Amino acid sequence: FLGAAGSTMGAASMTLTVQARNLLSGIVQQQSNLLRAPEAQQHLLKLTVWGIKQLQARVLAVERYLRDQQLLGIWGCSGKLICCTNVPWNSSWSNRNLSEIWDNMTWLQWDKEISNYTQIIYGLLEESQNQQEKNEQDLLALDKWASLWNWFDISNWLWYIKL
Amino acid sequence: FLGAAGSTMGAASMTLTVQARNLLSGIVQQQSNLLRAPEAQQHLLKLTVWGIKQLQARVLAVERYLRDQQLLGIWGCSGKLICCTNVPWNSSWSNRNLSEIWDNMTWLQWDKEISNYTQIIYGLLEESQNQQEKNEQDLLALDKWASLWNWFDISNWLWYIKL
Amino acid sequence: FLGAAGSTMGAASMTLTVQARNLLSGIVQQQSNLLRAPEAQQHLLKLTVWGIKQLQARVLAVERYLRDQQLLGIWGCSGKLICCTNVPWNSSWSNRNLSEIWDNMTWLQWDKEISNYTQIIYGLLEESQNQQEKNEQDLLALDKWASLWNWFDISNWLWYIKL
Amino acid sequence: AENLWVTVYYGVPVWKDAETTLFCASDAKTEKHNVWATHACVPTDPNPQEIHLENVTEEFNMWKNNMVEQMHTDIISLWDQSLKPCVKLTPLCVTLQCTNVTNNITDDELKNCSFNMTTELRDKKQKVYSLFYRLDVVQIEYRLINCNTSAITQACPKVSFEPIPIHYCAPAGFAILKCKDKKFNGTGPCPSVSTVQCTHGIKPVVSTQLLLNGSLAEEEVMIRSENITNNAKNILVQFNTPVQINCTRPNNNTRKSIRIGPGQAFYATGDIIGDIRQAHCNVSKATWNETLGKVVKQLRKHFGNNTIIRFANSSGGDLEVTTHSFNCGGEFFYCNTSGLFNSTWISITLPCRIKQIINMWQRIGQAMYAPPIQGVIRCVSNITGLILTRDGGSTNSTTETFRPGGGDMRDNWRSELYKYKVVKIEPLGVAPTRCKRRVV
Amino acid sequence: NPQEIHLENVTEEFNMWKNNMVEQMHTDIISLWDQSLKPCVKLTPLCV
Amino acid sequence: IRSENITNNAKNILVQFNTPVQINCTRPNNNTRKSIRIGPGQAFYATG
Ligand SMILES: *[C@@H]1O[C@H](CO)[C@@H](O[C@@H]2O[C@H](CO)[C@@H](O[C@@H]3O[C@H](CO)[C@@H](O)[C@H](O)[C@@H]3O)[C@H](O)[C@H]2NC(C)=O)[C@H](O)[C@H]1NC(C)=O
Ligand SMILES: *[C@@H]1O[C@H](CO)[C@@H](O[C@@H]2O[C@H](CO)[C@@H](O[C@@H]3O[C@H](CO)[C@@H](O)[C@H](O)[C@@H]3O)[C@H](O)[C@H]2NC(C)=O)[C@H](O)[C@H]1NC(C)=O
Ligand SMILES: *[C@@H]1O[C@H](CO)[C@@H](O[C@@H]2O[C@H](CO)[C@@H](O)[C@H](O)[C@H]2NC(C)=O)[C@H](O)[C@H]1NC(C)=O
Ligand SMILES: *[C@@H]1O[C@H](CO)[C@@H](O)[C@H](O)[C@H]1NC(C)=O
Ligand SMILES: *[C@@H]1O[C@H](CO)[C@@H](O)[C@H](O)[C@H]1NC(C)=O
Ligand SMILES: *[C@@H]1O[C@H](CO)[C@@H](O)[C@H](O)[C@H]1NC(C)=O
Ligand SMILES: *[C@@H]1O[C@H](CO)[C@@H](O)[C@H](O)[C@H]1NC(C)=O
Ligand SMILES: *[C@@H]1O[C@H](CO)[C@@H](O)[C@H](O)[C@H]1NC(C)=O
Ligand SMILES: *[C@@H]1O[C@H](CO)[C@@H](O)[C@H](O)[C@H]1NC(C)=O
Ligand SMILES: *[C@@H]1O[C@H](CO)[C@@H](O)[C@H](O)[C@H]1NC(C)=O
Ligand SMILES: *[C@@H]1O[C@H](CO)[C@@H](O)[C@H](O)[C@H]1NC(C)=O
Ligand SMILES: *[C@@H]1O[C@H](CO)[C@@H](O)[C@H](O)[C@H]1NC(C)=O
Ligand SMILES: *[C@@H]1O[C@H](CO)[C@@H](O)[C@H](O)[C@H]1NC(C)=O
Ligand SMILES: *[C@@H]1O[C@H](CO)[C@@H](O)[C@H](O)[C@H]1NC(C)=O
Ligand SMILES: *[C@@H]1O[C@H](CO)[C@@H](O)[C@H](O)[C@H]1NC(C)=O
Ligand SMILES: *[C@@H]1O[C@H](CO)[C@@H](O)[C@H](O)[C@H]1NC(C)=O
Ligand SMILES: *[C@@H]1O[C@H](CO)[C@@H](O)[C@H](O)[C@H]1NC(C)=O
Ligand SMILES: *[C@@H]1O[C@H](CO)[C@@H](O)[C@H](O)[C@H]1NC(C)=O
Ligand SMILES: *[C@@H]1O[C@H](CO)[C@@H](O)[C@H](O)[C@H]1NC(C)=O
Ligand SMILES: *[C@@H]1O[C@H](CO)[C@@H](O)[C@H](O)[C@H]1NC(C)=O
Ligand SMILES: *[C@@H]1O[C@H](CO)[C@@H](O)[C@H](O)[C@H]1NC(C)=O
Ligand SMILES: *[C@@H]1O[C@H](CO)[C@@H](O)[C@H](O)[C@H]1NC(C)=O
Ligand SMILES: *[C@@H]1O[C@H](CO)[C@@H](O)[C@H](O)[C@H]1NC(C)=O
Ligand SMILES: *[C@@H]1O[C@H](CO)[C@@H](O)[C@H](O)[C@H]1NC(C)=O
């Protein structure tokens, strides 16, 4: 857990050759202590201090661990820890070297690199995930899969596989 | 958010050419005010009025925003905002025009159209999603002469696309 | 709900020819009574006994109904009620008959069979799901300046776009 | 090169500094009637998985920390929660006709008070012996000292005040860092951090002017402050040597139960066995001379090596600021620590006075009444550090004076939550790569 | 409405002297007693 | 003019303005306060 967070992303390519260095299972499975005993107590005590504080911490962790699942759902990446997108690296102005990034830069320094435009990227991603990709998929079924291919106007299929 | 809810579904084809007009992100991300401060308070006050009311509102929003994810899971549509099904438009008796629906009718009037049979559709969908589709997929790891060549059903299999 | 839990897995092949005999919808939709009225009460009463007990039961059900979704996410099975894995039946020592298991054995007796090694299987599954399968997928789209240039793979693409 | 494409990554180990609620973790061991564990808040405390990170210099802070304010409001809320269902003593604020005692030595003292009470069936009152100290009766003959301030609810005698250690465990989606650098003074980048699920055993003691039973640092007696330049900034100091405090209270203290109305007893100190000596605390002068040698020989690194004097704490305040106040098994001491501070530049007794009516140990208002304890009270444990304040003034060059002031309760918990910090986890990260999706 | 479903085929072991619902019912009843009794009239002036 | 229905006579007729008419209210006396001690630390403020 977090075991190579200080490493560079090339030595934290090591982190995502393992389970993102166990980050997600440490997110949901560090609940196991307050999961093991909110109920082993058989005591009256007539009032509860943790009855609001532990509950607020618990549902805070749950909503935080669902917003990210919904955001991976909204970019077609649901289930997949590492997925790629149709959004290009745009005019976004931290254009730099590949062998600088994935060899000599930590994840935290990388967060300091692109601390701006992060909401720009998050707004940008679903655009290519949905507004044309879902509409192309909606086009792709309102034509018989094996009946159009005689016209010699087959590019539409080619167009949907290159652009 | 909700910005074209009064438009017709043709002008709310505009809504689902964008992120269903931002409906889902407004579902989960309008939590951010009670996410930003259930904890910025450092005050005793010895009792809490919101300690039940805010918590009940919060877990109400969470269970409502999980029942729909589970219902999209049960129809094989998990992740996908717009997906298609094998259930046909059945004997369901609001059979009408395509250029009437997706050109001149709002989403709310459409809800007033098919307010009945909605639980019929919801029961109907998982049937074609599971009871034969999952069983065909369970078949699809082993078969006899038929899988490569059954020469009977295939014409009807082509015929389903045909009619 | 639970309607053939006592049947053998061959007569509970009947259960998973229906919605695992309605188990998952009974998991999340038996909340509907405490979903229908934690709020229909308009009474002061100045204190609450259920304000901790019902809330603890509710978030207990929610975290239990999310750990399993995350565990299906970690084995690439997210969405799919029945999915297969690349992990073989290993040296695991309850090697026995196919026509004994899926004809004459209940689910509960089956749980009594493999009550051991269940955490071994759970640790074993993600290994073949990730440590080579995700790394093979990472090998797929990195090096192919010649991915646009494919000449003898069109046949699978054409087959695949129809079926 | 070619145009790269963005690739999301879910589970990137980055963190931001945040603030949230934590919770207990203790252990089970019946008679869990403790005021600070709220009868085993979380009785689990599992095995302490600690993970190093090897490669990150994270910045820390102890004077801007958030866990000390959470610990302070937790302790005052647990105090007022445990004190709530006990016996009120508003029928006690009456006129007392008192007189001295004479069985043993002078210079102790006690007042033999008697009042009209024992009111049981709302019609019958009785003349009742009682035996109060000074420092909680005043003249007019006598009344209690808190009757012009608020009511005087006594403690339930079944609960105890032993500080069993608690462990603050972070919620899910957060992490607790932990600096392992053995010379991290107060604030700044710690080069070698680590991650724990929860902290070590924190004994939540309450002691002014010499913090007790603490977690002692290494052989460099560290000096922590906010800045040395400001004269009104408390200079914590942390030891490496556990100097012992043999404290005691010599009398025998028979208890005597008084019935008040319906079923509410009241415990007043009866006639003692008859050996009135003074409550005191011994510290061996050799080890104290050495630990003062170490504190003064690592205080000359912060300014010029000249003329350190220490003094008694100019008083005023009350007993909370002038004397070393602590409780020793449910009896609240106040010990005149003048006799430990002379000029270090080149066995010890301590008279202790005992109050019984304690104020709210920070606030003004509600005030508890500690019932007496039978037998002879004797408890020993270690000191771990002082709390000093500089004086300064016109002393531009020499005769630097330090006097062990320090009155707040937060600084005790800043003396053990300095090597901890809470961080949130932002698992979602993007990065440009050479992969682009198969668009059907 | 009380939906009850048989299982037809399972011999499950039961216990009544190790049951947990009786302790929940007992602490529920004593807590409801002391909760309902709380805002009523004291009678400490009656002990005369 | 808002109501539930004008036909029922026992239905409150709200009315809403467009002009803020001012109300200059006052109380002319000076009202010294006087604190009274009651028992332990509970003051009581009576008009002196
Ligand atoms: C108060 O005393 C300290 C003593 O450390 C003075 O600080 C300076 O400290 C360094 C070490 O951190 C001294 O260097 C040492 O010198 C000795 C020879 O005397 C050598 O054997 C060691 O290996 C090391 O190099 C340095 O001499 C010392 N400076 C002095 C004594 O002037 C501090 O300066 C003193 N306070 C004042 C106001 O001078
Ligand atoms: C200073 O450290 C000690 C270390 O334990 C803290 O605990 C106190 O230790 C003494 C023993 O040295 C306990 O006294 C006696 O313990 C025996 C054990 O058999 C018991 O039979 C007696 O009834 C008596 O308790 C003492 O109870 C124990 N706890 C307290 C609250 O004094 C001590 O708390 C530390 N000092 C402070 C101020 O916290
Ligand atoms: C304790 O160590 C810290 C480590 O950073 C020192 O902090 C800073 O040190 C630099 C360089 O010496 C100074 O420029 C800063 O002004 C220091 N900051 C603070 C807040 O002091 C610090 O000097 C050391 N000493 C003390 C007493 O904190
Ligand atoms: C820390 O960085 C060094 C690079 O000098 C590297 O050799 C080492 O493996 C890194 N440690 C971890 C835990 O990644
Ligand atoms: C990328 O960065 C490395 C230094 O990290 C440098 O050696 C290399 O030449 C760079 N490549 C390009 C194409 O700039
Ligand atoms: C490469 O990394 C080392 C340590 O990680 C660092 O000292 C060096 O400056 C880095 N060089 C570049 C070009 O990033
Ligand atoms: C990133 O955003 C911050 C806003 O806090 C701004 O101050 C900074 O200039 C931006 N640009 C960077 C770090 O290049
Ligand atoms: C409302 O409907 C009219 C159709 O007459 C259309 O022109 C207009 O764009 C609609 N407004 C919105 C916000 O969709
Ligand atoms: C569909 O409805 C439109 C009116 O919205 C009408 O003009 C058109 O003729 C209809 N088409 C059919 C096939 O009925
Ligand atoms: C088409 O829409 C307009 C306004 O949206 C409405 O006035 C008209 O009646 C509609 N016509 C049909 C046939 O739905
Ligand atoms: C739809 O269901 C409602 C039940 O509330 C019923 O009254 C109505 O007749 C149904 N049919 C419609 C609106 O065509
Ligand atoms: C119970 O088992 C018998 C096998 O003897 C089978 O015939 C019957 O259908 C089973 N009942 C259910 C509900 O599955
Ligand atoms: C499998 O088990 C059945 C009994 O349930 C038996 O009749 C059959 O012969 C077995 N098959 C093998 C290959 O052992
Ligand atoms: C087959 O099932 C029946 C009832 O379910 C049982 O009596 C019989 O022993 C079983 N036989 C085997 C070989 O499992
Ligand atoms: C399964 O694990 C249990 C541990 O409770 C053990 O007692 C048993 O021997 C194991 N093996 C079986 C049931 O074959
Ligand atoms: C009681 O002690 C005080 C202490 O100064 C003294 O003034 C007073 O005279 C004493 N009274 C008796 C009766 O001893
Ligand atoms: C109690 O009341 C009696 C009534 O005369 C009085 O004499 C006595 O002095 C009172 N008690 C005290 C302590 O003054
Ligand atoms: C403190 O020292 C004195 C001096 O002899 C001794 O009489 C007394 O017993 C000591 N007290 C303790 C608690 O050790
Ligand atoms: C206090 O005075 C009463 C009066 O009779 C006496 O009996 C009692 O012993 C006195 N207490 C002491 C400690 O002398
Ligand atoms: C402690 O006792 C000495 C004895 O002379 C006294 O002078 C001093 O004032 C006392 N300490 C304080 C803080 O008053
Ligand atoms: C300092 O030493 C002198 C030596 O006579 C002694 O009288 C005095 O009490 C001591 N003061 C303190 C505060 O230790
Ligand atoms: C305290 O009083 C008890 C009661 O008789 C006695 O047995 C004991 O010796 C006394 N002294 C102590 C504990 O020093
Ligand atoms: C006091 O110091 C000793 C010596 O290191 C240590 O063993 C003990 O645990 C400390 N704490 C106590 C007695 O509470
Ligand atoms: C109200 O009017 C009277 C009439 O002159 C005047 O004396 C009085 O001061 C007024 N009060 C206020 C509050 O304006």
Residue numbers in the entry:
A (entry chain D), B (entry chain B), C (entry chain F): 522 to 684
D (entry chain C): 31 to 59, 63 to 141, 145 to 176, 190 to 395, 411 to 504
E (entry chain E): 80 to 127
F (entry chain A): 272 to 319
Could you share sentences copied from the article?
The trimeric gp160 HIV-1 envelope spike protein (Env), a transmembrane glycoprotein comprising three protomers each of gp120 and gp41, is the singular virus-derived protein on the virion. Hence, it is the sole target of protective antibodies arising naturally in patients or elicitable in uninfected individuals through vaccination. Vaccines targeting HIV-1’s gp160 spike protein are stymied by high viral mutation rates and structural chicanery. gp160’s membrane-proximal external region (MPER) is the target of naturally arising broadly neutralizing antibodies (bnAbs), yet MPER-based vaccines fail to generate bnAbs. Here, nanodisc-embedded spike protein was investigated by cryo-electron microscopy and molecular-dynamics simulations, revealing spontaneous ectodomain tilting that creates vulnerability for HIV-1.
Projection averages obtained by 2D classification of negatively stained particles revealed that one to three Fabs could be bound to a gp145. Finally, in the gp145•3Fab map, all three Fabs are bound to gp145 in binding mode 2. The 3.7-Å resolution of the gp145•3Fab map enabled us to build an atomic model for the ectodomain as well as the entire MPER for one of the subunits and backbone models for the MPERs of the other two subunits, thus revealing how the MPER is connected to the former. Antibody binding also interferes with Env function by exerting tension on the transmembrane domains.
